[PDB]
Ligand binder design. Structure first.
Ligand code: HEM
Ligand code: FE2
Length: 153
């Protein structure tokens, strides 16, 4: 459970994000792939972009990240009251794409890293801290849902 102050910082920085969902989406995916190329393998139609310029200019990849960041931002805005939208996501991620919880840390890392790099002044220690707290709540709660549907994190 996050303090009201922590939630405010989360949605403060995220408002920043919303000034360019697509661009942030791209840099997070690129960050993520580079740090952990096993990640790119679950992303089966993005498997074949070989460079970041290729990655950047791919509409498909682009739109993909918007879809993703938009779902994530809607979840953050519920300030933890989010089972109604955590459910369809864990369902497709648990029993389809088959994304292990470790992969959710990986992307949480990329997220923190990308936010800091673009919004340092709005992403100091308190803010950084809050976002971690939020994303660890997200990963706690989706793990719980992963188990309810069979096969774990
Ligand atoms: C903040 C964490 C992320 C969120 C909220 C999330 C959300 C979403 C959403 C909303 C979609 C589109 C509909 C659906 O399939 O549910 C999706 C698709 C997908 N997600 Fe995630 N994503 C997250 C993490 C990622 C990561 C970490 C991976 C791989 C390591 C993964 C792989 C995929 C794949 C492979 C698709 C299908 C794309 C296809 O159409 O080609 N997810 N995700
Ligand atoms: Fe993705």
């Amino acid at each position: 459970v996050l303090s009201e102050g922590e939630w405010q910082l989360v949605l403060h920085v995220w408002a920043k994000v919303e000034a360019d969902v697509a661009g942030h989406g791209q840099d997070i995916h690129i960050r993520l792939f580079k740090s952990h190329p096993e990640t790119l393998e679950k992303h089966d139609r993005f498997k074949h972009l070989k460079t970041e310029a290729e990655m950047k200019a791919s509409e498909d990849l682009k739109k993909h990240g918007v879809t993703e960041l938009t779902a994530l931002g809607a979840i953050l805005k519920k300030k933890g009251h989010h089972e109604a939208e955590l459910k369809p996501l864990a369902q497709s991620h648990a029993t389809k794409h088959k994304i292990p919880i470790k992969y959710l840390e990986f992307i949480s890392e990329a997220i923190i890293h990308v936010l800091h790099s673009r919004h340092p002044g709005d992403f100091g220690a308190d803010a950084q801290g809050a976002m971690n707290k939020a994303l660890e709540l997200f990963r706690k709660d989706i793990a719980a849902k992963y188990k309810e549907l069979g096969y774990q994190g």
